[PDB]
Design a protein around this nucleic acid. Structure first.
Ligand code: CL
Ligand code: CL
Ligand code: CL
Ligand code: MG
Ligand code: MG
Ligand code: MG
Ligand code: MG
Ligand code: MG
Ligand code: MG
Ligand code: MG
Ligand code: MG
Ligand code: MG
Ligand code: MG
Ligand code: MG
Ligand code: MG
Ligand code: MG
Ligand code: NA
Ligand code: NA
Ligand code: NA
Ligand code: NA
Ligand code: NA
Ligand code: NA
Ligand code: NA
Ligand code: NA
Ligand code: NA
Ligand code: NA
Ligand code: NA
Lengths: 119, 195, 65, 56, 49, 81
RNA sequence: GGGUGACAACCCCGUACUGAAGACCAGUACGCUGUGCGGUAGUGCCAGAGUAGCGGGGGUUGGAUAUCCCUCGCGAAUAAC
RNA sequence: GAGGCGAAGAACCACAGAUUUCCGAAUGAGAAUCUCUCUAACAAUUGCUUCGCGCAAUGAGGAACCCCGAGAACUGAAACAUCUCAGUAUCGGGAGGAACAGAAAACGCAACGUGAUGUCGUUAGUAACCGCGAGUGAACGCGAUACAGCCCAAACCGAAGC
């Protein structure tokens, strides 16, 4: 919420989470804030996911600004438990990155395009 | 490359700047309405906690403790004293606020032992610390090669004997050289002159 | 006559109980005779009634009665 | 009225009684506190270093 | 006053403690045991009840 | 683990209660109620108990005064034991 | 050394010698199983913050401008440090 | 005094077991050692948790010793205030058979040197403090005792785990 500057409509979040599941199976994903952070810094991140229910906010709050200076686009998801499940985990995940979008690569670019429009 | 953890660390170098400042200003509002000792499900500073031995695992517990700021809450002499001993206002306790916080947490959790603690900031009237405690009786701890030392009988009530990290620093044990003549091996064996 | 420990072990669990009851009864009657005072056939008997009772209860516990 | 013998006549009040915990007749039945062992005040037993000479 | 059952037991015991050393105990001990030192009078002494 | 009946209380007052009132007197465990005394007396002596009166005495024991039904004869019951 | 109706190596217990057990040393030492130590070159990838440090007020110390500690305020660098 | 036990090996001693009332940290609740009830209670705090007191923990004691806090005054200075008595007495909290300390952001006989810690002997009433009065008072080193060195956090891995 201090790190959240724009609102994502449920439909967008649905499409992004869907894209994430397919990118999981047909492509590469990083789960967890440390691995996500690494991929932004290493440049291998295509799309970055960040949950809004993260307590404390410290875990994830560096991500937007970091992603911005690495040119990596990012999207907000409401509950970390969905983000973790979408990424293939029994537990939640505060952040995730798509490294290889796989078959969802067309959809990823479009979701990126939709979010830049949310500014 | 930088760990994500390094970002939490870096934020906390300046608690009155940037996003963290906003965070604190919001959070403290809730903290001031909370009790003396509050068990929290996750550490506010994850880097510091892991640095201090915290693991996300059964039998590891974190609690945030509020303690009043400033000097000794001290009653004035009720009988004869030489002038040197008549003070009230400027007298300060020999245990730092952090150790007070650690003792209050440990008392709240009589079965648990204090591993370590760290500062989460302060308002004008009080300071908050988060204290990591460990269940010495839980087999997830008893089998952890990194934490199982704390299960030994001689580690019972470690905080109250000054065996904690804040305990040891506050006892003047930091230096191995000059200045430590009256602290090591203990304040008491040196006749209470260490501080 | 003295009740030995092998004889107590040779008893069935129900024989020990019935022997326990009998021994209590003799004791009760001995303490009744005493309360009349009421000289006994021998005072050495009440003492032995107590140890026999103790023995049986010990064996009952040992055997799992 | 004299504070001596004449005032001794009014003392029919029971205070200190045999204590359940230590057995001393120190249990003050009005305070519910034992003055000898601390029962009713303290879970720990009442004890003081001044009860003996300092060096023993 | 009004005694409780426990108080009553304690008073009962103190009365029992007021017995003499039995004659036969003096014979058994060759008179090494004669006086009862805990001997208590209701008037002259004071109980803890 | 304690028994109810300790022993008959045998004194002159007890004899008068036995002869004239059809009552038996016992030293009983001070933890025992009147009902428990009535029962125990019935089970041991094979009689019928009409009434039990109790007293905690200055000997430190409980004394029970147990009146027997007319079908029972106290002096007879007492003479057995 | 003691006992025994009075000064006892030889009257009795014991005492020297030799031997046995338990406890502590110690779940230690030795032994063993698994693991794998280390070196060169390249690489600013990592290395613990209200900290180090400074100021106000106190306590403490032999610690003196150079002890250790508390309290209020301020406050770094990143091993090329 | 009476009476009993023991060759069915008693007494007695060692080890192991059984029994072990009530109060007592005292824990279902109350109570000067007793009582009450839904035969029902780990009370209270807390960890895990099949979220059920299901599995566990704490409480209190102990001759002093040990560690962490609070901390006088008589007295000495021939008065007395800093100083001294003294971080003593006493108080609060807590561990163990010992405790605490402990593998250098050390030392600084300055070195081409020493090499975790404690303790003992010495260094030395030396350096240092102090109405520079009275008093106070180390350390490095050395000779000994005993010796023992290691694990994380992070980087890089990323569920390979408990
Ligand atoms: Cl938060
Ligand atoms: Cl503790
Ligand atoms: Cl050297
Ligand atoms: Mg304890
Ligand atoms: Mg020591
Ligand atoms: Mg007066
Ligand atoms: Mg008394
Ligand atoms: Mg009488
Ligand atoms: Mg009545
Ligand atoms: Mg001083
Ligand atoms: Mg109770
Ligand atoms: Mg003077
Ligand atoms: Mg003076
Ligand atoms: Mg002078
Ligand atoms: Mg001094
Ligand atoms: Mg030095
Ligand atoms: Na505790
Ligand atoms: Na000091
Ligand atoms: Na009297
Ligand atoms: Na009787
Ligand atoms: Na300061
Ligand atoms: Na016993
Ligand atoms: Na318990
Ligand atoms: Na439970
Ligand atoms: Na003088
Ligand atoms: Na004077
Ligand atoms: Na001075």
């Amino acid at each position: 919420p201090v790190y959240v500057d724009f609102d994502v409509p449920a439909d967008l979040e649905d499409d992004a989470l869907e894209a994430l599941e397919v990118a999981r199976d047909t492509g590469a994903v990083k789960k967890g804030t440390n691995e996500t952070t690494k991929s932004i810094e290493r440049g291998s991140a295509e799309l970055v996911f960040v949950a809004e229910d993260v307590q404390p906010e410290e875990i994830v709050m560096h991500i937007p600004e970091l992603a911005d200076e690495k040119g990596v686009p990012f999207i907000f998801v409401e509950q970390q438990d969905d983000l973790g499940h979408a990424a293939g985990l029994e537990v939640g995940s505060a952040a995730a990155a798509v490294t290889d979008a796989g078959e969802a690569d067309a959809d990823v670019e479009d979701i990126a395009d939709k979010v830049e429009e949310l500014r | 490359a930088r760990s994500a953890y390094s970002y939490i660390r870096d934020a906390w170098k300046n608690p009155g700047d940037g996003q963290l400042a906003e965070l604190q200003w919001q959070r403290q509002q809730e903290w001031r309405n909370e009790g003396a000792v509050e068990r929290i499900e996750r550490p506010t500073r994850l880097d510091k906690a892991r640095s201090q031995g915290y693991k996300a695992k059964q039998g590891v517990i974190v609690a945030r403790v509020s303690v009043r700021k400033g000097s000794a809450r001290k009653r004035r002499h009720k009988a004869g004293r030489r002038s040197k001993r008549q003070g009230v206002t400027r007298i300060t306790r020999r245990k730092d606020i952090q150790r007070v916080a650690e003792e209050r947490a440990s008392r709240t959790f009589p079965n648990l032992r204090v591993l370590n603690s760290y500062s989460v900031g302060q308002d004008g009237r009080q300071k908050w610390h988060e204290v990591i405690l460990i269940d010495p009786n839980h087999p997830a701890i008893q089998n952890d090669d990194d934490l199982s030392w704390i299960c030994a009988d001689d580690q019972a009530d470690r905080v109250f004997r000054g065996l904690t990290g804040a305990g040891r620093r506050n006892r003047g044990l930091s230096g191995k050289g000059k200045g430590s003549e009256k602290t090591r091996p203990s304040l008491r064996s040196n006749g209470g002159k260490g501080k | 006559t003295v009740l030995h420990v092998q004889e107590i072990r040779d008893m069935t669990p129900a024989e020990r109980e019935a022997e326990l009851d009998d021994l209590k009864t003799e004791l009760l009657n001995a303490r009744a005779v005493q309360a009349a005072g009421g000289a006994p056939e021998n005072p050495g008997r009440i003492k032995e009634l107590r140890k026999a009772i103790a023995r049986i209860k010990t064996i009952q516990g040992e055997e799992g009665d | 009225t004299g504070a001596g013998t004449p005032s001794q006549g009014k003392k029919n009040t029971t205070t200190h009684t045999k204590c359940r915990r230590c057995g001393e007749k120190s249990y003050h039945t009005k305070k519910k506190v034992c003055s000898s062992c601390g029962f009713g005040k303290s879970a720990k037993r009442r004890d003081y270093e001044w009860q003996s000479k300092a060096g023993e | 006053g009004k005694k409780s059952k426990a108080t009553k037991k304690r008073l009962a015991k103190l009365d029992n403690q007021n017995s003499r050393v039995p004659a036969w105990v003096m014979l058994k001990t060759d008179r090494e045991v004669q006086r009862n030192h805990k001997r208590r009078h209701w008037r002259r002494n004071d109980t803890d009840e | 683990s304690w028994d109810v009946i300790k022993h008959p209380h045998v004194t002159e007052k007890a004899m008068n209660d036995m002869d004239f009132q059809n009552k038996l007197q016992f030293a009983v465990d001070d933890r025992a109620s009147k009902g428990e005394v009535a029962d125990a007396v019935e089970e041991q002596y094979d009689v019928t108990v009409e009434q039990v009166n109790t007293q905690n005495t200055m000997d430190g024991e409980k004394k029970a005064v147990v009146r027997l039904s007319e079908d029972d004869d106290a002096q007879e019951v007492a003479s057995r034991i």
